[PDB]
Design a protein around this ligand. Structure first.
Ligand SMILES: [K+]
Ligand SMILES: [K+]
Ligand SMILES: [K+]
Ligand SMILES: [K+]
Ligand SMILES: [Mg+2]
Ligand SMILES: [Mg+2]
Ligand SMILES: [Mg+2]
Ligand SMILES: [Mg+2]
Ligand code: NA
Ligand code: NA
Ligand code: NA
Ligand code: NA
Lengths: 122, 140, 260, 178
RNA sequence: AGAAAUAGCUACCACUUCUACGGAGGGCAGCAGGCGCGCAAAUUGCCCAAUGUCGAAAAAAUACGAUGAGGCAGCGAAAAGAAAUAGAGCCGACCGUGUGGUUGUUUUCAAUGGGGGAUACUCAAACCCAUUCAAUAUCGAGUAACAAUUGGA
RNA sequence: GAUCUGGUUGAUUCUGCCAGUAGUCAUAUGCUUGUUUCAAGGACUUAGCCAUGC
């Protein structure tokens, strides 16, 4: 029958010049939507709402689906430019996009060598 | 009537302390002699080893043989007599096995027409005597 | 020599949830007491939601963006107390720490001229080596040459950007005070009288603006001015007037109904 | 282990387990409201006992008492709004006269049947558990929901339900795929 | 600065490990795990994302502080809160009572979750919830074998 | 919820204790267990003995 659309609204708003960002709460209305709605679709729509050059300046996380309904609420961050986004965003959030630091060795091995090198000098 | 003082709380406190030793229920919970004489050191159940199977007669108006066993406890090596319930159920006991023993009710008082027996057999070889009776399990 | 502070043992006015974490930031020693203050990490992360996590407050405080007495502070666990000006020059907002009518911390936006003024309460007057009269203050400041009329209970109006004393407000019946401890914290009223009780705690009897009467220990009043109008600083919304609990409940109920 | 969550109990078994008079009165309530177990009745017993106990304490207090005025208004506000007491009764003495079916009348399983959306009192429970009823355009699937006075006219079918304007249900879909 | 500190030192007493027999060590009532004891009690897991402490430290790069404190998941009817195991009728056979509930025999007719799968959400990474069986476009009870027990008369 | 019942006599009215009855974030054992939320978990006896890693 009918098509499935998505509408995005922002209830609370705040401008953060200390961390070069603006914060808000995202509301998504998706009546008739099948399944959930991936976060990249929100990023497209939020970019339309506040026209940004690069959609990667937008961050969305912590989204909860309302019981027995077609609503979903999450948090949202907007950065002035990509340079500020890289500096301030936590690593695991950048890795979600696919552009964070590679990896680190298992923590067990690191603390194993730390005690081993306590028996030796130089 | 009795003392009605408004400054006589000392006399009323002493009276209640002295007279509270006169009821057997309150005395049993504050005297430590019951725990020592009790084969279970104040515990719900205890584990023991079967020594032999005995048959004790019932009291006078009744007439039967009550099919008990003689059990030596493990935690303190005391000897007690315990009753094995339900029909049959003696063939599931055997000799030198290890059993779990519980009270009979009434907290140390003998029960029914069995003379001087206040313990019952619950588990044999750690399976469950009633489960064996209902065939829900097999003897290891 | 403790270094932690369990959540449940923290002051209630920080309003930290008991379901979020086990610990709280212990305020380092300094101008104000541990019980009678709130730290800079609390203000940045809990009062104004500039920072979400506690790592972000470091990203603000370690740069010296926040100032607390005209000097930027980099320590999150800095103790900030009553009558303190907090200004963030990048954002342009300045708050003064005061007590609201219910005895809780209140941050009220002040003007540019006001942000350079601070009120202090004398607690001790002594002599230094040589003959230097120096007076200690409720926030720990020491003033080298005060007015020779200063005494224990009075208050001083202080310029923070440049260190000097503006004027001294003594104690007496006419003046108006604000209660700073004892479940009457956050009430403004005049001094009806003060009772001596030598060797023990003096009792000061005060009259509210609405004609009510209340009393408290004399070590809990902070004289603001000689009149309500002549206040060097700004004041919170209610002006320290408390009203009946049933009236509070009823006004809240009807106000919600007209709102929707 | 270092947790600070809370929990409590909502019901209580009655003394004297077998009284023929109480057994029949409770059975009558169950088979006529279509309840599942006696615990549902015994929940109503304790919530009733709490309002009665606080009303009794307040009524003992003298009039114009500050505690009496504030709490007295609060309990009447809850009782009127929830639909336990009609708006004419306002003296705080009509609280004690509350009985069990008065609270059981406000249950969402009951109110659905009264409005006529169901053919019985057990049909309505099945409908509620299967995500068909919406109170204020929000789907509610818990029979013990106690309907407020300002929400009876908003009760209707849910959009997502096949009986509303939703897609065909399980039987229709599997018949089409057959 | 602060200890008469146990993942600081010294000795004696009880048990105890390696050795080339000259000697040298050990302290789980910290975390997980084993033996014994008993009626009686969980994995030799992942992580610094949150909460904090310490520090010569904000974050970012030609450049990632530690942390079994802490948190997360595995086992878990201690206990506590919600809650399925069916709803409407059809046609005979009826049961009582005076024509209105009812008790099986045939038989349609919708609805829904145990079950399984993602455009995917969560998550520090995985899991559980919460959404959804087309949005051109997505699986499924009928002797509902998807079968309620434990105690009694 | 400010509640009681069975046993002394050929019957009756008592004192009085045995037995019944409801709970317990109170422990253990037995039988039986589809879903979900929140959760305590080697105190009890032996402040007994401890391989290995942190
Ligand atoms: K020591
Ligand atoms: K251990
Ligand atoms: K079943
Ligand atoms: K029988
Ligand atoms: Mg150790
Ligand atoms: Mg256990
Ligand atoms: Mg006699
Ligand atoms: Mg122990
Ligand atoms: Na209320
Ligand atoms: Na030692
Ligand atoms: Na950390
Ligand atoms: Na934890």
């Amino acid at each position: 029958k009918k098509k499935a659309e998505v509408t995005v609204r922002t209830s609370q708003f705040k401008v953060n010049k200390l961390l070069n960002r603006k914060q808000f709460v995202v509301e998504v209305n998706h009546p008739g939507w099948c399944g959930t709605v991936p976060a990249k679709l929100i990023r497209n729509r939020l970019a339309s709402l506040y026209k940004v050059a690069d959609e990667n300046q937008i961050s969305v996380f912590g989204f909860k689906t309302k019981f027995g309904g077609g609503k979903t609420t999450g948090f949202g961050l907007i950065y002035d430019d990509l340079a500020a986004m890289k500096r301030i965003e936590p690593n695991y959030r950048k890795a979600r996009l696919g552009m964070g630091k590679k990896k680190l060795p298992a923590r067990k091995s690191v603390k194993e060598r730390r005690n081993r090198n306590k028996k030796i000098r130089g | 009537t009795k003392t009605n003082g408004q400054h006589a709380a000392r006399k009323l406190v002493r009276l209640r302390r002295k007279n509270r030793w006169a009821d057997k229920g309150w005395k049993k919970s504050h005297t430590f002699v019951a725990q020592k004489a009790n084969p279970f050191g104040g515990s719900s159940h205890a584990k023991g080893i079967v020594l032999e199977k005995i048959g004790v007669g019932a009291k006078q108006p009744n007439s039967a043989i009550r099919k008990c066993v003689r059990v030596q406890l493990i935690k303190n090596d005391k000897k007690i007599i315990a009753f094995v319930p339900n029909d049959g159920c003696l063939h599931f006991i055997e000799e030198n096995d290890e059993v779990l023993v519980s009270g009979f009710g009434r907290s140390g008082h003998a029960v029914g027409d069995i003379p001087g027996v206040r313990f019952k057999i619950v588990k044999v070889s750690s399976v469950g005597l009633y489960a064996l009776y209902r065939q829900k399990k097999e003897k290891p | 020599a403790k270094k932690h502070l369990k959540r449940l043992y923290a002051p209630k006015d920080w309003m930290l949830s008991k379901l979020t974490g086990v610990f709280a930031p212990r305020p380092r020693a300094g101008p104000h007491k541990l019980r009678e203050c709130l730290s800079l990490l609390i203000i940045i992360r809990n009062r104004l939601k500039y920072a979400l996590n506690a790592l972000e407050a470091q990203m603000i405080l370690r740069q010296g963006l926040v100032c607390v007495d005209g000097k930027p502070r980099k320590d999150g666990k800095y103790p900030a107390g009553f009558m303190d000006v907090v200004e963030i020059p990048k954002t342009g907002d300045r708050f003064r720490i005061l007590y609201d009518v219910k005895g809780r911390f209140a941050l009220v936006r002040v003007s540019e001229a006001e942000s350079s003024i601070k009120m202090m309460k004398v607690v001790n007057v002594y002599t230094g080596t040589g003959r230097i009269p120096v007076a200690v203050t409720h926030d720990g400041h020491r003033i080298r040459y005060p007015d020779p009329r200063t005494s224990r209970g009075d208050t001083l109006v202080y310029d923070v950007k440049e260190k000097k004393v503006l004027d001294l407000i003594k104690i007496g019946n006419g003046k108006v005070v604000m209660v700073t401890g004892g479940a009457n914290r956050g009430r403004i009223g005049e001094i009806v009288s003060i009772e001596r009780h030598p060797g023990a705690f003096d009792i000061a009897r005060l009259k509210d603006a609405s004609g009510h009467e209340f009393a408290t220990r004399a070590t809990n009043i902070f004289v603001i001015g000689k009149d309500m109008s002549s206040v060097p600083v700004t004041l919170p919304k209610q002006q320290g007037l408390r009203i009946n609990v049933i009236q509070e409940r009823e006004e809240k109920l009807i106000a919600a109904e007209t709102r929707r | 282990m270092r947790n600070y969550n809370n929990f409590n109990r909502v019901w209580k078994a009655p003394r004297r387990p077998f009284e023929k008079e109480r057994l029949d009165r409770e059975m009558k309530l169950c088979g006529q409201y279509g309840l599942r177990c006696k615990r549902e009745i015994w929940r109503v017993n304790m919530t009733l006992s709490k309002m009665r106990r606080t009303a009794r304490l307040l009524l003992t207090l003298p009039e114009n008492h500050p505690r009496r005025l504030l709490e007295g208004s609060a309990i009447m506000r809850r009782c009127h709004g929830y639909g336990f007491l009609d708006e004419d009764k306002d003296k705080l003495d009509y609280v004690l006269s509350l009985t069990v079916p008065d609270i059981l009348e406000r249950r969402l399983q009951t109110v659905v049947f009264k409005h006529g959306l169901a053919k019985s009192v057990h049909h309505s429970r099945v409908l509620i558990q299967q995500r068909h009823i919406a109170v204020a355009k929000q789907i509610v699937t818990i029979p013990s929901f106690i309907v407020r006075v300002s929400s009876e006219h908003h009760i209707a079918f849910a959009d997502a339900s096949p009986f509303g304007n939703g897609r065909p249900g399980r039987v229709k879909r599997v018949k089409r795929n057959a």
